[PDB]
Design a protein around this ligand. Structure first.
Ligand SMILES: COC(=O)c1cc(O)c2cc(NC(=O)NCCCNC(=N)NC[C@H]3O[C@@H](n4cnc5c(N)ncnc54)[C@H](O)[C@@H]3O)ccc2c1
Ligand SMILES: COC(=O)c1cc(O)c2cc(NC(=O)NCCCNC(=N)NC[C@H]3O[C@@H](n4cnc5c(N)ncnc54)[C@H](O)[C@@H]3O)ccc2c1
Ligand SMILES: COC(=O)c1cc(O)c2cc(NC(=O)NCCCNC(=N)NC[C@H]3O[C@@H](n4cnc5c(N)ncnc54)[C@H](O)[C@@H]3O)ccc2c1
Ligand SMILES: COC(=O)c1cc(O)c2cc(NC(=O)NCCCNC(=N)NC[C@H]3O[C@@H](n4cnc5c(N)ncnc54)[C@H](O)[C@@H]3O)ccc2c1
Lengths: 343, 362, 362, 343
C-alpha cells in the first residue's frame, strides 16, 4: 500500500537492500573520490544553501552526505536509510558528536514519518544509465517533505547517448553466443537455441569504459529536472534521437552516460560520468545491436529509446534506430537488470 | 510443498532466475572436467541405463538426459524448475528424442512423475558440496526410486584440512582498515572498523591455492545418497582431529569435495580437490578470526557445524583448538555471501618451501 | 669556521659527497628553466659583468662562472667545497679561461680571496628556498663584496598558500594502517600505529599539483640578499592571514619560491611557482595533523616558524586557526627528511571543478 | 676502540642507523612476504632449535624475528638494535605480553654487554650482493656470545655470479654519460670530463631485476659459512671465476644474486634472491663493463672479483675478466655505496 511496495516485487527489494547493507559496498562507493569529493565540494561551496537549514538525506547509507551537510552548517539533518546500514550510520553520528544535528530515521522514505518540512533534499539516487535501480522515484517522492522554495542536490540530470563502433565488443558477444551454434556438443545438437542465446546475450547492457574515438556523432541529451518532475514521469521515458553521422562505418550500438548538476545559490557544480572524464563506479553503458547498421558521414540515424519501468526496480529498454537514407533499421530489447560487467 | 517450507521466496526467485540464463548453462557445460566426467560415468556404465527409466533432477539444458539417452535409456523424466525447462524441450525436439525424454517443468518436490524410475541422475553439488541445498531435492527425489534403484552420483566426500596463508589473513585487515581513519573527508570512520573486520571474516573464500599451504592430511565426511534422508542435511556435524605435519600459523580450514558414480561396470570419480584440475567449484576456505600456532606433531581438533537456513545455504560454525596448548579459535561464516577471490594467476607456493638451493636448480 | 660551527660533520660529509657526483651536476644543468634563466639574467645584464671581478659561491661544474666570462668579466673566483672543484678546473683549462676563472677549492667561509669583488653569483636555493642552509654561505660571502656591489640573485620570495587535497591527507593514514593489524605473522603491531602516523606527517611532501587545490591568494615573505645577515636565517617567522576564496577542508600549506636578478639593464625572475614550468625544486606541501574547515570569506591565520638545525635544514612549526570558528591545528615537520611523491603524471584537478557540463564541452 | 667504531666512519654510521630508525623502512622490509615468511617458517619448522633455548637477535629492528623465536618456544631472547627503532621494539614486546621472554638491549652488538651465552643467533644481515652494509661482520662478531654447540640462522650464504648481455642497459648508461661529450652546452665545452663521467656512471652497480634469458653461462658460486668464518674474513673477499660460455654475444658485465640457508636440526630452508625466484627487496645486482667483451660459445671467461672493505660500511669492488681464447680483457671498479636503482 506504500508507494515503494506497489512498484517493487518483494523479492527484488530484499536483495536490493541486503546489497547496500554490506559495509564493503559502502566502502566501494565512498572510495570513488570523484563521486565523494564532488558531492562534498558542491555542498561546501554552496554553504549558504545549508547554513541553519533543515536537510533530508534520501538513502544516506553510511551517512557520508549528511556529514557534509553538517559541515556546511545545517541545523538539522534527517538521514533516511532502509537497509541495515542505518545502524552503522547511527554509530558514526554518535562517534562524531553530531547526535544533536543528524537524526537517522530507519526505513523507506516512502513509508517513514518525518517531523517537519525541509529546505533542501540531498541524495545519490543515480544508477547505471542514471535510471537503473529506480531510486530517482524515491528521490522525487521525498519532495512531499520539501518546502515550496526548497532546493535539491543534485538538481538536474542529463542522460547522453551517442552511436558507437566497436567491432571487437560486437564479436566478443557474438562469439559467446555462437557456443549454441554447435551441432554435436558432446554429441548433442544445440543449434536450435542459437537464436535464443543471441537474444539473451545482446539484451545485456555492457558496463565498462571506452575511448571517445569510437563515438560516431555528437551526443543527444535528455534532461530530468528533479525540482519539476513527478514520480510518474519515470515510469515511461521516451528519448527520441536524430544523430548526424560524422564518420562512416558500422554503428554497433548506442553508448550512454550521464551528468548531474548541483545548482546552488553560490555556484553550479557538475558531476560527470562521461568517457572523457575520470572513471567512476557508474562507468558508461553501451547497448549493442544484434546486427550493425552501416552509415556514411552526413547520414542521419534516428529513432527512439523507450524505457518502461518494471517491478524488479529496473527498466525494459527498447531501442529502435534507422539510417534514414537507406531505411536500414535495427530494433532491440535490453534487460537493465542483467548487465555484462567487462572492466 | 517441501521446497517452499524450507525456502524463502526471495531466495527461490533469485535462484531460479539465475539458472534460467543460457549463459549460465553454458558456463557449466564448458567445464570439461564436469561435463566429460558425467558423460564418461554414464556411458561407461551403459548397463545401468540400457532400457531403464531415468529421472534427471534439475536437468537445466537437458545435457545429462541426452547422455542417458546415448546410453540406451528407454524413458527419461527431466525435471527443471527454472524457465530453462522450455529451452530443454526445444533441444529434445531438435534432437528427435521426444519419445524418450520428457521435460516436466517444475520443482521435483511438487511435480507428478507417471511412474517409478530405476536411476536418478543430477548435478546437485554447490560450493563445499552442500551450498544451495539442492542435495535435499536430490534426496527428496528418492520417492520415485524403485527399491533396487541407483543414484548418479552415489556418494559425496567433503574434505577439510587446515591451511596457513598469511597473505589471505592479512588481506582482511587491510581492507577493513579503510574505516580506521579519523578524517575521511572530515568524518571519523574508526568506530566501524570492528564491524568491517567481522563482515569480511564471515565470508568463505572461493578460489584455489597451492597444496603446500595445507598442514595436515585432510579429514573426510561422507554422505551416501542411497541411504541419506533429506533431514540429515539440516544439521551437519563434522568433527575433526588433525595431526599436524608442518609447524606454522593455522589461519583456517580448507574445504573441497569428491563425488563417486558407482555403476555396475565401474566407479567414476569427479574430484574438486586442489591436486586435480580446477573446476567451477574451485575450493573453499573459511578463516579463523585468530590464527592458531601449531608445531608438527601437535593435534588440532574441533568441529565444523553446518546449520541450514532458509536462504538455500548454511551458517558455518568452526571451533578449533591446539590440544597441546589449549589455544582456541572460532568463527561464524555465512556461506550465502562468499568472496570470489580467484584471479586466474597460478597459486604461488608458501614461502620457505625450498629445501634445496633454487640457484643450484638453475 | 662559521660553516663548521653550524654544521655537524655527518651532515657536511654526506652533503659535499652528494654534490661531488657529476651525475648530480648534470641533473641541475639539465633543468633548462634553471640554467637558461641564469644564463639570460647574466648575459642580458652584461654591464654588471663587463670587466668586473666576480665571486661564484658553490660553482659546482663552474657553469655560472662560464656565463660570467661570456658576459665579459675580467676575473672570476669560483669557490667550491666538494671534490667537483677539481672537475671545474679541468673545464676551465679545456675552455682556455685559466686567466679569467680561478677555482678556489674549499668552503667560502674558510678560503682566502685575493681581492674584493663587484658581484656575487650563486644558486643557493633549496627546497622551500631555505633548505640545505646554503643561503647563509651566500650571505657570509658578502665579506668579499665591494660596498657598491650586487648579488645575483638579489632577492628571494617564499610563497605560502592553503591547499585542499583529501587524497594526499588520507594517503598518510593508509600507509600507517599497515601497523594497525593484530596478527601480522602472529604479532600485534597496533601499538605503533600512532608513531607511524606521526612520522609520515613530519615529512614535507615534494611534488607538484594543480593550482585549483589552492584556496587563497598566496602570502609572500621576502629576503633581500643585499641587506640580509647570516643570523637572520636561523629563525624565520612567517605570519600569514589568508582570506579564503573557496570553502573546503584545509589540509596544509603549500610552499614555493621566486628569486629575482636585479641588474642595471633589467630584472630577470626564476620562478618555481605551480603556475610556471616545473623545475627540480618542484613545490613543497606541509600537512596539518588535523584539517580545518573554512568557508569562502573566512580568514585563516597563524605563523610558519622555521628554526635552523645542525643537519643543514630546518624544523618547521606551523600553527593555524580559522578565525571565525576558533578551530585550530598545528604540525611539526622535519625539512631534512622530505617525502618525494612526484610520479611524472600531470596533476589531476580537484573534484567539483566543473562549473559547466563536461558532456556539452565535448 | 670498539670493533664497529674502528671499521666505520662516524659520518657513515650516523646516516646508516638513522635510516633504520624510520618505521616506514621497517614496514618496507616487513612487507617483503618472501623475506618475512621464509624467516618465519625456517624458525617454526625447526622449533626444536629454539624450544627452551636462549637466543640472540642481531639488529632486531622492529623485533619481528624475536617474536618468531618466541613463537618457536624460546626461553629468553636478547634483541640487540643500535638504531632508535629499539624503543619501538620495546613497545611491541610490552603490547604482545612477551616482557618475560624478549629483552631488548639497545646498542651495537659489538659494544653491549649480554648476561649469558646463547644457543642460537638469528639475524638478517644481508645487503645488496649479500656483502653491502658490512653487517655480516657484526653477525660474525656476535659469535663471541655463541655456545660451542650453537647454531646460526642463516647458517650459510651463497653468492652467485654469471655474465650477462643487455645492450639496452649498457646504452642507457653510456647515453647518460654522453651528456659530457658536448662541445658547446650553453656555449661551454664539457668534453674534457667525458672520461670522468663514464667512470662515475659505470662504477655504479645496477640494482633491479632481469630475465634469466640474459645470462650467458652457468653461474659461479662463492660460499660463506657463518658458523666457521671470522669477522676478518670479509675485509678482503676474493672470488675467482671461470665461465664456460653457452651462447655467443657481447658480455656487458656480471650479474650477482645470493642465497642463504637456515640449516636446522629438523630441516634446511632456503631463502633465495635469484632472478628465477619472486622478487625481494634485495633485487639482483649487475656490474657493467665500460666496454663489452665478445665471446663465442665454448670460450672461457675468467678472472677475479675482489671486494675490499671500506670505512663507509661498503666495499670497493674490482672486477677483472678476460676471454681466454682472444685475450680480450676488461677491468672495472664499482662503488657499492652509490648504486643505480632502475626498478
Ligand atoms: C546482480 O548482480 C549484477 O550483475 C549487478 C547488477 C546491478 O544492477 C548492479 C548495480 C550496482 N549499482 C551501484 O554501483 N550502485 C552504487 C550507487 C548508488 N548508491 C547509493 N547510495 N544509492 C542507494 C542507497 O539508497 C538507499 N535507498 C534506496 N531506496 C531507498 C528508499 N526508498 N528509502 C531509503 N533508502 C533507500 C539504498 O539502501 C542505498 O543505501 C552495483 C552492482 C550491481 C551488480
Ligand atoms: C551473489 O554473488 C556471489 O557471491 C555468488 C554466490 C553464490 O552462492 C553463487 C552460487 C553459484 N552457483 C553455482 O556454483 N552453480 C554451479 C553449480 C552446479 N549447478 C547447479 N547446482 N544447478 C542446479 C540445477 O538444478 C535446478 N534445480 C534446483 N533445484 C531444483 C528443484 N527443486 N527442481 C528442479 N530443478 C531444480 C536449477 O535451476 C539448475 O538448473 C554461482 C554464483 C554465485 C555467486
Ligand atoms: C635523502 O633523500 C631525500 O629524501 C632527499 C633529501 C634532500 O634534502 C635532498 C636535497 C637535494 N638537493 C637539491 O635540491 N639540490 C638541487 C638544488 C640546487 N643545488 C645546490 N644548492 N647546490 C649548491 C652547490 O654549492 C656548493 N656549496 C655549498 N655550500 C658551499 C660552501 N660553503 N662553499 C662552497 N661551495 C659550497 C655545493 O657543493 C654545490 O656544488 C637533493 C636530493 C635530496 C633528497
Ligand atoms: C643512499 O641512498 C642510496 O642510494 C641507497 C644506497 C643503499 O646502499 C641502500 C641500501 C638499502 N638496503 C636495504 O634494503 N636494507 C634492508 C635489509 C637489511 N635490513 C636489516 N634488518 N638489517 C639491518 C638492521 O640491523 C641493525 N644493525 C646493523 N648493525 C648493527 C649493530 N652493529 N648492532 C645492532 N644493530 C645493528 C640496523 O640498525 C637494522 O635495524 C636500502 C636503501 C639504500 C639506498
Amino acid at each position: 500500500r506504500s508507494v515503494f511496495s506497489e512498484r517493487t516485487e518483494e523479492s527484488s527489494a530484499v536483495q536490493y537492500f541486503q546489497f547496500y547493507g554490506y559495509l564493503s559496498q559502502q566502502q566501494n562507493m565512498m572510495q570513488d573520490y570523484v563521486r565523494t569529493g564532488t558531492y562534498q565540494r558542491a555542498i561546501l561551496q554552496n554553504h549558504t544553501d545549508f547554513k541553519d537549514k533543515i536537510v533530508l538525506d534520501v538513502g544516506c547509507g553510511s551517512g557520508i552526505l549528511s556529514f557534509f551537510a553538517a559541515q556546511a552548517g545545517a541545523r538539522k539533518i534527517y538521514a533516511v536509510e532502509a537497509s541495515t546500514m542505518a545502524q552503522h550510520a547511527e554509530v558514526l553520528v554518535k562517534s562524531n558528536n553530531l547526535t544533536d544535528r543528524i537524526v537517522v530515521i530507519p526505513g523507506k522514505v516512502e513509508e517513514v514519518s518525518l517531523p517537519e518540512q525541509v529546505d533542501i533534499i540531498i541524495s545519490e539516487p543515480m544508477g547505471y544509465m542514471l535510471f537503473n535501480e529506480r531510486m530517482l522515484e524515491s528521490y522525487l517522492h521525498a519532495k512531499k517533505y520539501l518546502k515550496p522554495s526548497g532546493n535539491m542536490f543534485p538538481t538536474i540530470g542529463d542522460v547522453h547517448l551517442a552511436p558507437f563502433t566497436d567491432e571487437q565488443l560486437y564479436m566478443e558477444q557474438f562469439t559467446k553466443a555462437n557456443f549454441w551454434y554447435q551441432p554435436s556438443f558432446h554429441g548433442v545438437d544445440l543449434s536450435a537455441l542459437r537464436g535464443a542465446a543471441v537474444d539473451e546475450y545482446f539484451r545485456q547492457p555492457v558496463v565498462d569504459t571506452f575511448d571517445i574515438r569510437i563515438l560516431m556523432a555528437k551526443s543527444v541529451k535528455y534532461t530530468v529536472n528533479f525540482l519539476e518532475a513527478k514520480e510518474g514521469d519515470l515510469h515511461r521515458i521516451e528519448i527520441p534521437f536524430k544523430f548526424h553521422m560524422l564518420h562512416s562505418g558500422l554503428v554497433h550500438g548506442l553508448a550512454f552516460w550521464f551528468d548531474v548538476a548541483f545548482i546552488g545559490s553560490i555556484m553550479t557544480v557538475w558531476l560527470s560520468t562521461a568517457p572523457t572524464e575520470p572513471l567512476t563506479h557508474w562507468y558508461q553503458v553501451r547497448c549493442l545491436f544484434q546486427s550493425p547498421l552501416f552509415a556514411k558521414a552526413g547520414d542521419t540515424l534516428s529513432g527512439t529509446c523507450l524505457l518502461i519501468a518494471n517491478k524488479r526496480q529496473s527498466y525494459d529498454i527498447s531501442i529502435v534506430a534507422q539510417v534514414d537514407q537507406t531505411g536500414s533499421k535495427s530494433s532491440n530489447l535490453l534487460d537493465l537488470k542483467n548487465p555484462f560487467f567487462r572492466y
